[PDB]
Amino acid sequence: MKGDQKVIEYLNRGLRSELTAVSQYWLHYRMLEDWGYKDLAKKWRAESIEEMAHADKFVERILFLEGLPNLQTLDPLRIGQTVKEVLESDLAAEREARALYQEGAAYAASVGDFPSKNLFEELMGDEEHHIDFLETQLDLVSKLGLELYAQHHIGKLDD
Amino acid sequence: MKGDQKVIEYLNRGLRSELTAVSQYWLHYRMLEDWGYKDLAKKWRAESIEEMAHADKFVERILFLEGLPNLQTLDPLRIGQTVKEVLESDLAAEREARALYQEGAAYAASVGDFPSKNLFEELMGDEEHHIDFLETQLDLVSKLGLELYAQHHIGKLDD
Amino acid sequence: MKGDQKVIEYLNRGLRSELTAVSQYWLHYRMLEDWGYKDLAKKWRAESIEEMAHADKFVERILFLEGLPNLQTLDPLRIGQTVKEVLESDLAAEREARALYQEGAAYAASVGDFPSKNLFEELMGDEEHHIDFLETQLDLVSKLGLELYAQHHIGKLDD
Amino acid sequence: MKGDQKVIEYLNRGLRSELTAVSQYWLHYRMLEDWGYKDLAKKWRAESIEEMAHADKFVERILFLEGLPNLQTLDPLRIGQTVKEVLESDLAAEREARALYQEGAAYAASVGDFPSKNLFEELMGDEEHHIDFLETQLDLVSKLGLELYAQHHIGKLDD
Amino acid sequence: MKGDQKVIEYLNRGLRSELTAVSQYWLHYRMLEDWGYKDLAKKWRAESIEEMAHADKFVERILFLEGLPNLQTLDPLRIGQTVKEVLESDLAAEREARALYQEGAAYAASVGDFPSKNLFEELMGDEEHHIDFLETQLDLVSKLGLELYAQHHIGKLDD
Amino acid sequence: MKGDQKVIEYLNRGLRSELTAVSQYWLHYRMLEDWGYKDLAKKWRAESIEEMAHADKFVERILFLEGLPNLQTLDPLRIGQTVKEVLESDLAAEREARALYQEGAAYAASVGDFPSKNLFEELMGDEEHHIDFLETQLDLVSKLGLELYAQHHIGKLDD
Amino acid sequence: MKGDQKVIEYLNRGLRSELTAVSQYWLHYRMLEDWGYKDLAKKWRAESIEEMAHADKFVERILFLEGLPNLQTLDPLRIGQTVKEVLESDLAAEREARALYQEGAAYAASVGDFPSKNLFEELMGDEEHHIDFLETQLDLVSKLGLELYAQHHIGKLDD
Amino acid sequence: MKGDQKVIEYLNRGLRSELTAVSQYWLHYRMLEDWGYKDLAKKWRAESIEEMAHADKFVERILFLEGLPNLQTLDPLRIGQTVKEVLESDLAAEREARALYQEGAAYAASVGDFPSKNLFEELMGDEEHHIDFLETQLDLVSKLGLELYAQHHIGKLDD
Amino acid sequence: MKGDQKVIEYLNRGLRSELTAVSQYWLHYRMLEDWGYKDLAKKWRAESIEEMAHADKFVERILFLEGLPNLQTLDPLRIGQTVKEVLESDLAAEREARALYQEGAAYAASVGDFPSKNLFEELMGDEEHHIDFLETQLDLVSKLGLELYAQHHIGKLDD
Amino acid sequence: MKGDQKVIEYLNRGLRSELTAVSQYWLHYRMLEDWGYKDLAKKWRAESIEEMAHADKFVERILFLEGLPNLQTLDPLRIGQTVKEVLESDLAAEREARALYQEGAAYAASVGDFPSKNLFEELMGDEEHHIDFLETQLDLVSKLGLELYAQHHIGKLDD
Ligand code: HEM
Ligand code: HEM
Ligand code: HEM
Ligand code: HEM
Ligand code: HEM
Ligand code: HEM
Ligand code: HEM
Ligand SMILES: [Fe+3]
Ligand SMILES: [Fe+3]
Ligand SMILES: [Fe+3]
Ligand SMILES: [Fe+3]
Ligand SMILES: [Fe+3]
Ligand SMILES: [Fe+3]
Ligand SMILES: [Fe+3]
Ligand SMILES: [Fe+3]
Ligand SMILES: [Fe+3]
Ligand SMILES: [Fe+3]
Ligand SMILES: [Fe+3]
Ligand SMILES: [Fe+3]
Ligand SMILES: [Fe+3]
Ligand SMILES: [Fe+3]
Ligand SMILES: [Fe+3]
Ligand SMILES: [Fe+3]
Ligand SMILES: [Fe+3]
Ligand SMILES: [Fe+3]
Ligand SMILES: [Fe+3]
Ligand SMILES: [Fe+3]
């Protein structure tokens, strides 16, 4: 069904944002695993897979609206070198994704594309749950120090 | 453990090749679904998820070798506009991936990094199964014509 | 609870649209069955039952807002005489229903009747999934021809 | 138990015929798989395994009659290059095997070796079922054309 | 995918070697059963069926590499007249098969056909397990004499 | 139904042969048990019961053809005094029974009594399996000596 | 089967290296248990038993190649007096074992003993997983300090 | 808890004895397997694992008494070249271990270290069961000859 | 049965020691629970119940030997005021109980009362396991500090 | 293994004592059953079977030490004629067996035969449990009179 070209542009901006988060979370998962924080690694792997579902919802919507989904390029990645910098990198990206979705929902609403608007608002609400998650981990790091925070989430040793 | 710099560069080239295949297969999956070839869409979703696991093997090995995995960029995507061009696009990409892993395995062997060599060889074997699959599909298209080939794989209608 | 009279008018327009789709899909189901395309018949029967649920949601909302639901009349039916004309008739009706729901959601939003607005937007999103379904079947008919498309969905012979 | 030398010669001719069919069917199975007709491939694999059982029954009978089973050589293979030529190659071989078994049963009967006669007649009846199978596939190819026949038996795509 | 001509010749030589082993082991199985060594017959039937799977791996790889698998001929069979000569016949054949796969793996490696190289190496390892088995049996025959060795493996009488 | 008198005479000769084998096998079973070869005893008991089924099939056929089954007399029994002589006695009887059945099948065939012919041929095939069994045991005794052969089949001690 | 003398010497050097690791890991396991780090003791017991299986693979291959496995002596043990020195002791030993297997695989390859080459490569890959594990533990100790690292792994108290 | 230094010296002598038996039994297990006596191989593997448990009990006791367990060195191994020499080698070692444990139990008793005394006496009783086992096998070899003894324990052939 | 009066005196000294440990452990369990270290509390409760079983074994033995078990009085209790002092109090008591049992076992041995001697030696071995437990906890407190040690064993909060 | 001759003499004295108790308990069981005290009969039957296990442990130990177990003769039996005399007869025998085992354990200890010493001490402890049992029954008879004691253990009447 022929979609609004500007809504399609917002959908493709969203897809880009999600692809970036998929890779940034997945890299951070494997970094956390390499550093030995296995419980934090398990959560990051789960967060990356949630973002993969988000990316998929954008590709499907773009195609339904007869647009061309662009998976060629990512936004710039922010790569930590400590557990605190991993948290802060992901938080900064999630804040930019939420702002994008807020913009895309308002735009879609203004042209009557209510199902696209609902997609952006559902994703906005999901990104606020990730922001809440990340802010909470940074608050722990503030109150307890990074060492006590990360030590709690080392996890169990493999068989 | 500090790895050979050149083996790490090959592993990063492989990572890029897999991330490209992941996005290329996923977009093709969703294009095939949008066109109504549900059985070919199932297969492409499965192939993409296989490539996801390959990408993850490269990230893991790069970190073990104290390299920086680079997920920032993809090789250029080849996007088909017909079922036949989807088949041809994926086959071109798999042929380049197979040659890259052949080269990476030979290089890793020449510096005694046998576990990196075995990762490239195992992946080279997997990509050959992909090539076999894609070549077989194109053969069916040559012998039967595209309409007969694609009609067989429309699949079942959703509840 | 006393509702906005204009929202109630949109609800009754929606009910009319749904009653029309229930009957048009059900007739097309039984036509597809009479022509022998049993797999297409099963899907049309399922689509008519989904529309019956839609009709029911409008009757319930109209009554809650102290309106009188009007089930007396249908919009004009479009009846195919070939599988292609069945697809095209249902697509044209679904396009008119989506536009109605878009209008009803915006109107309801403008008077603060948010639960009515949500009803219209949920139904708008459902109608876009039917449009996506129908467009896909027409695309198959375009790429493969009507005979190869319909032959795939003849289905199994009854015991 | 000392057998009739000429019956033993017919048994060894039969063994040769079966070894030839085992290999010809197995090669055709793997050809059909390489071309993508997976449902025809599954049936050819099953037919080759039935012939393996036939070969085994001849080796056992030859030994019981104190002969030397000769598995050194095959009759000439007929290798298709299209699905039609695969069907025709196997049919021609099955016609020669049936004639051999008919001859071996009559001979064995004429010297009173009734259990050998029963072996040849049981195998003759099995070969007529394969001939019936192959003739039927060629009849389909005649009435529908090779493309519609082979397209029906492409089968499902692997996980 | 077009393969190296010389790797394909090695794979066809391997195919011949496996088809020879299949028939040699199967005939030995049935000779051992005819002599009454039922436990040694069970083991030989199992070894033959292992070699069948090896033959099939070679047919599959030759076709993928767009070669013509040749199942027409076998290498010369070695047929024992005692349990000891059966052991010695099979061991001679396995030693020639192991050397052929060693050569094929080294050649495939030298042209970068690593998946064909890994097929020959995996089979070379399997043939070494066969050699180990057969050497062990001949050792028992040296230490205990053939009568004691073969008597242990007569097995149970059939219902 | 009135049968051919000569076929009935062959049926009664067969019945006599079977009664003889029932008793000869049963006596040898109990001899083998008394000497302590319990595994050979179990097999002889099973062989006698198979012959009892054979005897029964002759009594039923004779009656259907309105003959008088004669169970009054046995052929002369051959009673071993060693395990080797038991094997040789049963082999000599089985050779005479096979020749009788061969004669009875040919005769029945020559007068069109095909179901009687089938009975004799089915029994001929059964007797060749017993001959194969006995010949194999004698071959073991030849290659290993009687003591090693019989020792293997002493079996387990009763609770 | 007679093996290459130098490959057998490499396999015996590998056997010594594994027997050393078995005893070193087992003693460390029991020292960690004595100090009260029950979760680190579980992991070390598991690592020792992994090394036991490696030692056994070398004994088996040496005997197949008609060598004499030498279990008489170990390389010098490195015994830690703190959790950190246990980690460092095991990592030094694993780095020497990895280099030995790299050398053994390259030598076995150069004489065409591919199954011995594959045993060294598989073990070289396993030792790299050990190295990864140990390096990760030392990283946690650098980032968190030894007290925080070791406290996390005290584990549960026994019933 | 600070132990008696001489008891600790006996514990470490015991540990040495057990390490020696672990390796000597394990090597003999794999020798028996290479020669084809699989039932004797299974028992030797089980005996080596029992000795591994014995070794572990000494390491634990030494640490509890604040000694340093020494796993660096083994007593000299006795390696058979026939089944009889394997039995005799293990018997000679078990006789020396029993005498050691007898000495260690008496010593521990004389300084009041009753739990160490109980350890040595429990192990002494275990070693007498191994001696009883080995003496019995040598008695069989004496009464029956080595060939009949070893032939009984060849075991079953692997699938 | 009339026992040795001095053995009975040692049994009653033992009973006194056990009653003291029952109460000291139980009080410390409830102290640890009141301070919030629930995992340490669970272990102390379990240790007190083990000591209750020890006390019971002394009452039963005293009665069998026709003595009067004296449960009137306890040795002086040592009550901690910190987790470290709880560990040290229980260790000091366990050291005195082990010395008592060592004395009682030697005495009983010197008058031939072997079952009483076995009781004291079994209990001596049990007390060394408690000493090992307590020493290990003090070692943790030494290496990690009391705060990190006790924090690990706070346990879970009740429903 | 060659044992100490005097220990073997004590073992055979023990065996004699046990054989005597087996028969004395079994006779008393059947006497108690004949008099109608079925619950006392069940316990005596159980006590005789425990003594049978004791006798067996002595025969096994004597043989392991290369002695000749002597089961020819019993110590003199003491046969009651009332329930009180049955109790007193068994008590007197158990007192003599305990004294024997005490002597045998001390002797075995003095020559270092610790496993024999452990056997005598384990049996001494078992005999004290029987003495405790018998003394308790006599105490009941003293406090309640023989009639009230025996009446309680008449038991149930058989179906
Ligand atoms: C960084 C690149 C990526 C990596 C390393 C990656 C990794 C993976 C892995 C390893 C799994 C399987 C998880 C499991 O089975 O436990 C997975 C699942 C999935 N991925 Fe990816 N992925 C990547 C990119 C993508 C992209 C670009 C998309 C779609 C646009 C995608 C969509 C999915 C979906 C939808 C699933 C779940 C499939 C199912 O549950 O059926 N992922 N991902
Ligand atoms: C063309 C006129 C219609 C026809 C031919 C029709 C046919 C049917 C049939 C045969 C079923 C049962 C499906 C089954 O049990 O498999 C059904 C279910 C249903 N219909 Fe209708 N229907 C029609 C109009 C309506 C209308 C006007 C409504 C409400 C406004 C309605 C609401 C429902 C609902 C809600 C169900 C499912 C009931 C349940 O699952 O409990 N249908 N329809
Ligand atoms: C072209 C040469 C052959 C190939 C490629 C081949 C292939 C195989 C394969 C892959 C199987 C196992 C099928 C399964 O497990 O699904 C098999 C089974 C079997 N084959 Fe062969 N085979 C060949 C020649 C032989 C010969 C020469 C004989 C006997 C003369 C034989 C007798 C059997 C029998 C009897 C089975 C079934 C075994 C059972 O079910 O226990 N095959 N064949
Ligand atoms: C030597 C004279 C024979 C002896 C010692 C004998 C012994 C037996 C024994 C002990 C069984 C039962 C086997 C079991 O239950 O495990 C049996 C079964 C049988 N016997 Fe006989 N038999 C003799 C003669 C006959 C004759 C003359 C016939 C018929 C002509 C006969 C027909 C059968 C049949 C048909 C069964 C199996 C019955 C069933 O499975 O329902 N036997 N024989
Ligand atoms: C010759 C050197 C050794 C070899 C070849 C060896 C081999 C093995 C193998 C293959 C297993 C696992 C058995 C199974 O899972 O079936 C094992 C188990 C075991 N080994 Fe070793 N081992 C050796 C030395 C040691 C040493 C030095 C000790 C301790 C001092 C040890 C203690 C154990 C224990 C305690 C188990 C059983 C573990 C469990 O059941 O959880 N072994 N051994
Ligand atoms: C400090 C004085 C004691 C306290 C506070 C105490 C507490 C308890 C508690 C609460 C239980 C039940 C545990 C459960 O069911 O989870 C118990 C079990 C037991 N106690 Fe005591 N106890 C004390 C003294 C004794 C004494 C003096 C003895 C014997 C001399 C004794 C022997 C037992 C035995 C044998 C059990 C387990 C009973 C069974 O499992 O059947 N305790 N104790
Ligand atoms: C007075 C002479 C004896 C009599 C009347 C006797 C009676 C029995 C009875 C009737 C049983 C089976 C109990 C049951 O199945 O409920 C039995 C078991 C047993 N007896 Fe005897 N026995 C006697 C002497 C012996 C001797 C001399 C020994 C060994 C030296 C012996 C060792 C055993 C053993 C070990 C069992 C248990 C077997 C098992 O559980 O597998 N008994 N006794
Ligand atoms: Fe997202
Ligand atoms: Fe997010
Ligand atoms: Fe890949
Ligand atoms: Fe691929
Ligand atoms: Fe609707
Ligand atoms: Fe709709
Ligand atoms: Fe056939
Ligand atoms: Fe056929
Ligand atoms: Fe093979
Ligand atoms: Fe082989
Ligand atoms: Fe018969
Ligand atoms: Fe017969
Ligand atoms: Fe290792
Ligand atoms: Fe390791
Ligand atoms: Fe031991
Ligand atoms: Fe031992
Ligand atoms: Fe205690
Ligand atoms: Fe205690
Ligand atoms: Fe006793
Ligand atoms: Fe007793």
Residue numbers in the entry:
A (entry chain B), B (entry chain A), C (entry chain B), D (entry chain B), E (entry chain A), F (entry chain B), ...: 1 to 159
Question: What did the original publication write about this model?
Answer:
Bacterioferritins (Bfr) solve two important problems for bacterial cells: they reduce the concentration of toxic free Fe(II), a source of reactive oxygen species through the Fenton reaction, and provide an accessible storage of iron in a mineralized ferric form. Bacterioferritins also possess 12 heme-b molecules intercalated between the protein subunits, this is the main feature that distinguishes them from eukaryotic ferritins. Here we report the crystal structure of bacterioferritin from Blastochloris viridis (Bv Bfr) up to 1.58 Å resolution. In Bv Bfr the ferroxidase active site consists of highly conserved amino acids: His54 and Glu18 are terminal ligands to iron 1 (Fe1), His130 and Glu94 are terminal ligands to iron 2 (Fe2), and Glu127 and Glu51 are bridging ligands.
Bacterioferritin from Blastochloris viridis was isolated from its native host and crystallized. Native crystals Bv Bfr diffracted to 1.8 Å resolution. In the “as-isolated” structure the ferroxidase center is fully occupied at the Fe1 site and 40% occupied at Fe2. Non-ligated conformation of His130 was not observed in any of the “as isolated” and “Fe(II)-soaked” crystal structures. The iron-iron distance is 3.97 Å for the native, “as isolated” protein, 3.81 Å in the Fe-soaked and 3.92 Å in the double soaked structure. A long iron-iron distance such as that observed in native and double soaked Bv Bfr, has been reported when the irons are reduced and not bridged by any electron density. In the “as isolated” and “double soaked” Bv Bfr the ligand-Fe1 distance is located within this range, while the ligand-Fe2 distance is longer, making the ligand interaction with Fe1 and Fe2 slightly weaker and more symmetric. We expected our aerobically isolated crystals to be in a fully oxidized state with an empty ferroxidase active site, but absorption spectra showed that the hemes-b are in a predominantly reduced state as judged from the sharp peak at 558 nm, although a shoulder at 564 nm indicates that a fraction of hemes are oxidized (black curve). The spectroscopic signature after X-ray data collection is unchanged (red curve), hence our structure of ‘as isolated’ Bfr contains mostly hemes in the reduced state. The ferroxidase active site is blocked for irons in the native state, but becomes instable upon “double soaking” treatment.
